[PDB]
Amino acid sequence: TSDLIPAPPLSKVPLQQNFQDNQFQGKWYVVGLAGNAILREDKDPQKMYATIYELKEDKSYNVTSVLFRKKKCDYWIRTFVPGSQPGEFTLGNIKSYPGLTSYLVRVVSTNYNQHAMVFFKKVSQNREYFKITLYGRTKELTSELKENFIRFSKSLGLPENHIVFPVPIDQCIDG
Numbered sequence: 001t002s003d004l005i006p007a008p009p010l011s012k013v014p015l016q017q018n019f020q021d022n023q024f025q026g027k028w029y030v031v032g033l034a035g036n037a038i039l040r041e042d043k044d045p046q047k048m049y050a051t052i053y054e055l056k057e058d059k060s061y062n063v064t065s066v067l068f069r070k071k072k073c074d075y076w077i078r079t080f081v082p083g084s085q086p087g088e089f090t091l092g093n094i095k096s097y098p099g100l101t102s103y104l105v106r107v108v109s110t111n112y113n114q115h116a117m118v119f120f121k122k123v124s125q126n127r128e129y130f131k132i133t134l135y136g137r138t139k140e141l142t143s144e145l146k147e148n149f150i151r152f153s154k155s156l157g158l159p160e161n162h163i164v165f166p167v168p169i170d171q172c173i174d175g
């Protein structure tokens with residue numbers, strides 16, 4: 001029902017050159033998060049969660065995000081399939097998600113052992129949603145990388161109340 005900031009043309013979202021799927025694997029913490037249905041919530045700040053990418057034999061990722069919610073560890077699980085050029089992905093078993101007609105992932109940049117920026121886009125009940133995650137191998141990143149992520153999001157038309165920085169926690173996400 002509610003109006004949405006439109007998705008940007010893909011022409012504005014870079015693709016990472018020579019993507020290495022082996023080195024992008026393992027666990028990443030979500031240290032920055034923006035998108036058109038992401039809202040700053042000062043009363044109740046978003047908490048850091050993690051996303052583990054596991055490379056399978058068939059070259060798909062099995063993908064698990066671990067979050068802390070209502071005193072418990074939640075697990076959100078899905079398969080990312082290699083898309084039309086390397087470092088992009090489509091969603092496996094799209095039909096089994098009600099309302100979902102379109103899903104897209106594009107890794108924007110990464111140095112594989114410190115940080116990454118990734119882009120996501122879905123159509124759900126004919127509404128078009130998008131987000132950008134700032135990832136780290138630890139729960140901390142520098143001012144430089146964070147201002148880099150604020151500039152890139154703003155370049156996609158997101159104002160600053162649609163850009164947030166999950167607070168580090170120890171429950172569920174560690175290992």
Ligand SMILES: O=C(O)c1cccc(O)c1O
Nearest residue numbers: 049065066067074076120
């Ligand atoms: O639906 C979720 O809980 C969720 C968790 C991690 C990452 C996502 O994109 C999600 O939609």
Ligand SMILES: O=C(O)c1cccc(O)c1O
Nearest residue numbers: 078091097100103122124
């Ligand atoms: O956010 C979602 O709706 C979603 C749907 C299907 C698969 C996913 O990984 C998601 O995050």
Ligand SMILES: O=C(O)c1cccc(O)c1O
Nearest residue numbers: 037120121122129130131
């Ligand atoms: O949560 C979201 O806003 C969202 C947006 C685009 C794609 C997703 O998977 C999401 O979870």
Ligand SMILES: [Cl-]
Nearest residue numbers: 030051065133
């Ligand atoms: Cl994520």
Ligand SMILES: [Fe+3]
Nearest residue numbers: 076120122131
């Ligand atoms: Fe999602």
